[PDB]
Amino acid sequence: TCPFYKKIPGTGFTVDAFQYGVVEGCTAYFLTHFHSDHYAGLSKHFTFPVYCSEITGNLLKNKLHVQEQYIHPLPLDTECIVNGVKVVLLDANHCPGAVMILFYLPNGTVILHTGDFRADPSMERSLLADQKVHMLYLDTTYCSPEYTFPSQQEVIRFAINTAFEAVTLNPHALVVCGTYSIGKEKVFLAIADVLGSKVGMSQEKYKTLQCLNIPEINSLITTDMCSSLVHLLPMMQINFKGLQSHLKKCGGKYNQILAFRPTGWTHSNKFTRIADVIPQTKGNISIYGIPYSEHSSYLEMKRFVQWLKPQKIIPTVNVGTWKSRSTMEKYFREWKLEAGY
Template sequence: MAQKVCGPQVQKNLFQAWGIEKPPREEAAQGAPVGARASSSSPSPSPSGAWPGRKRRWGGSDENGASRKPVACPFYKKIPGTPFTVDAFRYGAVEGCSAYFLSHFHCDHYGGLTKKWCRGPIYCTALTARLVKMLLSIDSAYVCPLELDTEYVIDGVKVTFLEANHCPGAALIHFRLSDGKTYLHTGDFRASKSMQLHPLLQTGRISLLYLDTTYCNPKYKFPPQEDVIDFVVRTAQRYLKKQPKTLIVVGAYSIGKENVYLAISQALEVPIYTDASRRRILHSFGWPDLSKRISSCNQSSPLHVLPLASLQHENLKKYLETLDQRFLAVLAFRPTGWTFSEAAGKELDLIKPSSRGRVTIYGVPYSEHSSFSELRDFLKFLRPQKVIPTVNVGNAANRDKMQAYFREWLKST
């Protein structure tokens, strides 16, 4: 293995340098496609071509001006029996960790990564790797992109990334140890029926599941994403029919919610305007249909993408005024599970917009995290031996309540 140092390395094989075992030629094979049923033998390894709102976990300085050490890495970010951690970049050099996994490129998961990173290899999907290098200026020598649905051997552990149905580049991480134990870390994910078709999840029982429990509460009842997108498109068409000079705005994080505004663009046959920073990110995805629709002219399209936090009436009123009367009204969509209406539940047509003057804002329950019922169905299908929640675990009452749900769901399987 090549020596790990701060700065560029001269190396012929990055995977070999970071300890990925290259299989013998006769055994090399592509990972099984999603939906294919696994054979009796394991696929051969193939080389590749936090919590929301959590504060930075550094201690700052004491009264003498000396830097305090970062807090210890939580147990639920360490994978037992391995030298691996998941989304654990803000805790300094984690003792015994030789490989750092990044589930996806959201700041509550990559927090702590800077261009000075030199603590070890970062394993992530190819799309996430591009974002890590482009936006955080991480030295390429430390970034190890792995393909989805392809098994790799890292430090003697078989590792496979699965589609997480969260944001672009997000992955579930499946670990199979030499003693036969299997662990699944969901990162952030939206459970779906298609996940149940993956051969790795159909064969063998998961020993330990690290579960995204963002919405592990029965009050969170989200419709399917496709239904929400259909509602958004129909609503946009209805408003444009009444007032053709309506500006459609979709709120989004730096990455995430792309399917919402892409569907509007396709239905209305209009380009998507957003700022230069987001355009750079979107082009990096390598999605041809999205890239060809992106516009740099805010006057050329009635569809704009703005930061989710900016979708307030006064902000949108001022934004409208900057467009030189090109548009006469604003229809904005705030697509997030946090804005769901419990009264409306799954009945999207019961959603009431917030209107003030020329600005109308819809909060729509388009979530990229699993609803309560989706978590239940996923656990009943997966039947893990043990579940560790990774979100909303700050107090014992929450943890106990979630564990009670898990016991109830698994009792009936």
């Protein structure tokens, strides 16, 4: 049964609620982004209207085979009417195609559902500037002050400089990057651009990337692994055993691997600066864990909420324990007392 924090009151709508069967009273299912915890339950047998971004709708049709007649893609930054209710989709600064949804209820209530997001000051000049929000359904993934990490631009500077140094010292080194979902494509695209290479990958991952409307993508990726010195592998294979095995497969073209695991936060964040990050090494294999996040840090989240000044906050992440819920409620009250709303 569908939890309350997936339901939009005063509408027929749900958000990211496909794993509960037919939800009573739901006339339109919204999907914020193509991550498995959120799409869980969708398939070619789904026969209700799904509302989403264009990129999300390319992935539903090509990867999950949802039939076209049930996909309703909406343009961003554009007022649209869905089943009698005005909605707007906004860029969430998460993975490709990810949105926040603004719902203008028939009684005058305005609701923002962030989906998954990485808050940014650029959001203070979107269509959110223009009116008051009564209720915020908030991605609280990293809602505690221990969660710090650098900007995405500092992380990509570290990765490019590390890869370019290694391959210029040893032209026979291979770079490997882990992946298990869409998102974080800048990691491997920026490294392949500094090296003058395409990114090589499996046919299944090439298919997924071809749904993303990334400009000039045919110039940047390939299924011909032999032609590429940046390879993408499943995240589970980014370990010494899995990398040794991959290096065997390349037929003596390479004699070293430098590998990247873009994680979110790890507790090495509480001690080490990006500048000071070092790899784990075994023989001719090195593995870097780099803190590339597509969710808000604590400080980014706090700034967004203190700017928006919502009347009520409903967390959508970390809701399953009483200790998490009480922690989060305490921070919300601090933020509201400090800012004065």
